[PDB]
A paper describes a structure:
To delineate the structural basis for 9A8-mediated broad neutralization, we characterized cryo-EM structures of a prefusion stabilized Omicron S trimer in complex with the 9A8 Fab fragment. 9A8 binds to the apical tip of RBD, partially overlapping with the receptor-binding motif (RBM). The 9A8 epitope includes only 7 residues, forming a relatively small patch, which largely overlaps with the binding region targeted by ACE2. Surprisingly, one mAb, 9A8, among the ten tested, showed high neutralizing activity against all VOCs and VOIs, with the IC50 being less than 0.1 μg/mL.
To improve the local resolution, we performed local refinement by using an optimized “block-based” reconstruction approach, enabling reliable analysis of the interaction interface. The distal tip of the RBM inserts into the cavity constructed by four complementarity-determining regions (HCDR1–3 and LCDR1), involving extensively hydrophobic interactions. Additionally, six hydrogen bonds formed by T415, Y421, R493 and H505 from RBD and S56, Y58, S53, S102, S104 and N30 from CDRs further facilitate the interactions. Of note, 7 residues comprising the epitope are mostly conserved with two single-site mutations (Q493R and Y505H) among all circulating SARS-CoV-2 variants, informing its neutralizing breadth for SARS-CoV-2 variants. More importantly, Q493R and Y505H do not affect the neutralization activity of 9A8, revealed by its comparable neutralizing activities against WT and Omicron strain.
Author numbering:
A (entry chain A): 1 to 107
B (entry chain H): 2 to 123
C (entry chain E): 330 to 530
The structure:
Amino acid sequence: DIQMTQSPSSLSASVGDRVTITCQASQDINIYLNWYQQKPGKAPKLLIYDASNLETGVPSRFSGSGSGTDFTFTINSLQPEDIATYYCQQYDNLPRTFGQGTKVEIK
Amino acid sequence: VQLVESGGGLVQPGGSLRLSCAASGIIVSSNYMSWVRQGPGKGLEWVSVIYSGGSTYYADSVKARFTISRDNSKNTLYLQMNSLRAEDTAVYYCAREVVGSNSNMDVWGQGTTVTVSSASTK
Amino acid sequence: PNITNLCPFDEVFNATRFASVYAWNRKRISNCVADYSVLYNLAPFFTFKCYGVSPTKLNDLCFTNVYADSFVIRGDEVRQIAPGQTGNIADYNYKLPDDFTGCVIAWNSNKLDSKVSGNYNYLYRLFRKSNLKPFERDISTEIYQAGNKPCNGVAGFNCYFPLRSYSFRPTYGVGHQPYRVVVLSFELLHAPATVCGPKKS
């Protein structure tokens, strides 16, 4: 089992500003990792393929970079249709583990 | 390529149903299917993944209680539960696992909000 | 006893490039001597973690045919190469029998195989989608089509190329490094045994 941990849980203070969201792993894993965005009461939706790529239709300003058990991503502009959660997903080392939960909100 | 929600109703502890999620033409046996759970107020927890080779890999919390197989031609994945301890009052999300190594494939599927309680519908 | 013979074990224990995961390169060594102390002297000391025959008597209890393999994988599949466990390399690339006599040997290869840029010459079959019988090789280079839509082309959506690549940048830690595994295997056809070690009869 891999302890998927994140300290900055609730970034509801940022409105159109810098986001310093990150997650960490217990054992050393490489870039084999994705994050999700789950709308409340709806299905999740993908943004990052394997810590270095980007989804087909998204704003281009989403950029993630992380290697060696610290994994980092930023949302510098908070458009109002991104009001959902963001979860950290380790895979390819069984069992695949999820983060506890990150909350964003616009004021 | 979308997925179909198939499930619902109220069930008791000790009783189980057959969860189902269908496909819009995607092969379910010769592909990589995966289900997760989502409780109210908490994060996702992984439930199961099945490979195209028939390798049943599922979590250690639900060991020897879940059985899972894909249909040959109806494009529907089936999983039968055994001996539910009522902690899975949650919504069970169906998918294929989202990327092999690097592709633009990303589609998710809708899941039903099942509940397990000793009290029936009132 | 007798004057010993040179043996081509180092020929499969030293090369500038082993074969990738798509084709486990067989090398049917026959009529040679048995000596494996140079294998211990090559690396700092590790357990083989190997299943068929105990490593303290690989020098004795000699065989009729050794069937050796040469392929380079990750450390998770080093602990996962065991018979009975499945996965992606252990299912879709290389599977062992349940009566597998013989046992594997592994060592780390950061200084040889890994490159600062990252050598992408080593690549593996992630999509093969047929359960594999023990000990055969499948080369399906051609593209697969999925989704009940006839693709038959080059580079389309839901048209997946079955051979994707390892990344071997040297800054990673233990578990994603290149490891050269030489899976020796013995079969007993009751032939006259031509592979045996030093002895006097």
